[PDB]
Design a protein around this ligand. Sequence first.
Ligand code: O7S
Lengths: 206, 142, 7
Amino acid sequence: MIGLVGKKVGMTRIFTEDGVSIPVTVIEVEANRVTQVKDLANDGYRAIQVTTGAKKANRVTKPEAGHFAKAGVEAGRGLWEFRLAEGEEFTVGQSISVELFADVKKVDVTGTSKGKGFAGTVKRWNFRTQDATHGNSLSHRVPGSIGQNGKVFKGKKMAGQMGNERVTVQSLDVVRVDAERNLLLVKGAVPGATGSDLIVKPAVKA
Amino acid sequence: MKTFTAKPETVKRDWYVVDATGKTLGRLATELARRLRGKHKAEYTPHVDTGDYIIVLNADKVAVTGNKRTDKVYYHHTGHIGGIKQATFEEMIARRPERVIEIAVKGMLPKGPLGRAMFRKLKVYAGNEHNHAAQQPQVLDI
Amino acid sequence: XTXPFXX
RNA sequence: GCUGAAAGCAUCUAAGCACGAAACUUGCCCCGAGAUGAGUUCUCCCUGACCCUUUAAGGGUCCUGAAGGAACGUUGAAGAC
RNA sequence: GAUGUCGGCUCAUCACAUCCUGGGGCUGAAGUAGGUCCCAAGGGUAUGGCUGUUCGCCAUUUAAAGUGGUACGCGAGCUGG
RNA sequence: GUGAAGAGGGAAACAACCCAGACCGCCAGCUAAGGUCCCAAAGUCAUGGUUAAGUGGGAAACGAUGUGGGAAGGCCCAGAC
RNA sequence: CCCGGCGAGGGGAGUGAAAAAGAACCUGAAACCGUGUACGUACAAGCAGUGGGAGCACGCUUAGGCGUGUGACUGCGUACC
Ligand SMILES: C=CC[C@@H]1/C=C/C(=O)NC/C=C/C(C)=C/[C@@H](O)C[C@@H](F)Cc2nc(co2)C(=O)N2CCC[C@@H]2C(=O)O[C@@H]1C(C)C
C-alpha cells in the first residue's frame, strides 16, 4: 500500500534480551496529513498527496497557502505522492500516524544520497589503481584507455558528480513502532544525512 | 511569365477523416503521403505545404498479407553500444499501434523541415473516437 | 635518431 | 504434444488448440514533457485615462508595479564556478 | 614533406563456432557420472613459480578458469623488460 | 573500347561498366539506357500464367509425398491401393 | 578657457586653402577589430554555394506589380594546386 514521509534522526544500537545488538535507523515520522485525493475522472491515476512538518507563516507562498487552505490543513515542508493499489481510500484533512506500519514487518526506504561532489573513477566506479612506482609518470590514479584505434561509447564510466541523487534501499526489517514518540526503528542504514527527508513504503520484494 | 508557385500564407488546407480497418498498410499510407504533400492539388508546390489535414481512426485494425504480422521486424537504436531493440508487428499494435502508420509515412515523405511539417498534419487514433469534430472534418473513402 | 622520439 | 485431414490408414499442422529456457517484452531501481508530438491537476496575482498614427496581433505617453522571482547578506552533512 | 612496433598495466567493447550456469533430443543413458547434437550470448569466466615474453610447463584452486574481432583493441593513457 | 585528356543521364552513392560526344542562350517538344505506388518526374495500366519463400533482395554438392505443367507406363466394378 | 593627477589624453577657441594637418602629421587600399540600421536566425545535420522561391524593409513608382538588400522552405551539389 502507501508509505509515509519522515526524517532521518540518526542511528543507534538496540540490545535485546538475548544480548544481541540490532543496528537501527531511527526516523521521526511526524503525523502526516493528506492534501489532495485524485481520481481518474480528472487526472488519470489513483493516488494521493501528503505533506508533513511545518513552515513559517511569512515565508510560505500564497499559491500553496490556498492549496493547503483548500483542504483546511496547516502547511508543511513539502509535498509527495503515493499511488493506490486499487483498494485504498482517503479523504483530505485526514491525519495518518506511524501505526500504519504495525503489521508489515518490512519496508523499502528511499532518500537522497550524501554529496561527494566531483569524484574520480576510483571513488566512483571502484577502478583499479595503476602502479605507484616502477616507471609510472603522472598516471597513478588515472583511468587509462577509454576506447580503441574512434568515439567514446555512451555510458563510459568516467569521473563526475557522485551522490546527491535518489536512492532506494529495499527489504529493511522493522524493529519497533512507538506511536507515542512518532518513531520508526528500521534495521540497517538508509540514505541521506541526519535531518534529511526520506520516504518509507512497505516492501514489494517481500 | 514565371510559372505559378503556391504561397503558404494564403493557401487552403482542408480536414478529412479516415478508417484504416481492413486496409493494407503500404497501399494505404502511400495515399496519405500523396495528400499531406499536396500532389493531389492543382496548386502543388514541392517547397510548400499545400496538403490536407487527415484524421485516421482504428489504427489497431490494419490489414497485412503473409506472416508480416509476426515476421515483420521494427528495428531501432537508442544511441548506445547494445542499443538495437527489435519489435515484431504484433508487439507494436498491442503496445502502441499509432506508431505503425506514423512510421510508414515517415519513410514515404521527404526528409527535411517540410516532410516533418507534413507529419504534423497527420493525426492517428487507435479507436473510433476523437475531439476534432470542431474542425468540421470530412469523409474520405481511401 | 636514437630510437623512439627523441632518445 | 492433443485433435486431425490433405493421402479412407498414419502424422505435432495445413485451419484450430495446449506445454515450453538465465535470451527478448514485463515486473525491481534511477534519469525522464527540449516527449518543439514541447503533456496533465490544484492554487495564487493584474478588472487603468487617452492621444496619434501605412488603422494594425500597430506605436507612444501619464498613472499603475501585484502574485512571484532575482539580487544582496548570514550559511549548509550542497558545492570546482 | 613520418600511420610509433611484441608483452605487461589500465580501461574496456562486440560476435557466438558455448567454458560454467539455464532449456532439450538420441545415448552401447540402470543410478551417480559422462559422450554426442540442438536452442541459448542474460550475467559470470583463477591466483602464483620460471621466462622480456604471448604461448607453454609446473603447483594449488574454481560451478567454469571460453574461442575470436576491435591498427595481432588501447604509448597526444602508463610502462620500456 | 572507354578513362587518362570526356562533362551529361543510369547503375542507391561508385575515373575504366550501359546510354550518349557539352559552341552560347530560352520556364519548347520528341527519344536512348533505365524506369513508371511513395521519398522521386512517369501505368496501383491491359491479357493470360507462376511463386507463399518477403523467395524476390548473397551461394554449392546433396536431401525432400513443396508446387504447377508435359509425355508415357504398371496395376484398377474379375473389386484394385 | 574647461574635464583630468600643476598628468597622459581629449573638447572649444585660434592660425591656415586644409586640424577629416595635433608633429603617432601628404595621399591613407586590404587583411584584421568594432559601433549603428534593415532582414534573417535557438526541431535543425554535411565545401556553406547554385537554380527556383515565400515573406519583410527601403527607394522608385504619376498605385504600374520593376530594381536594390535580406534569403524561411526546396532540387542538385564531397574545395584549390
Ligand atoms: C636504429 C633504429 C631502428 C630503425 C629505425 C628507423 C627509423 O628511421 N625510425 C623512425 C620511425 C618512423 C616512423 C614510426 C614512421 C611512421 O610514420 C610509419 C611507421 F609506423 C611504419 C612502420 N615502421 C615500422 C614498421 O612500419 C618499423 O619497423 N619501425 C617503426 C619504429 C622503428 C622501426 C624501424 O624502422 O626500425 C629500424 C630497424 C628495423 C633497423
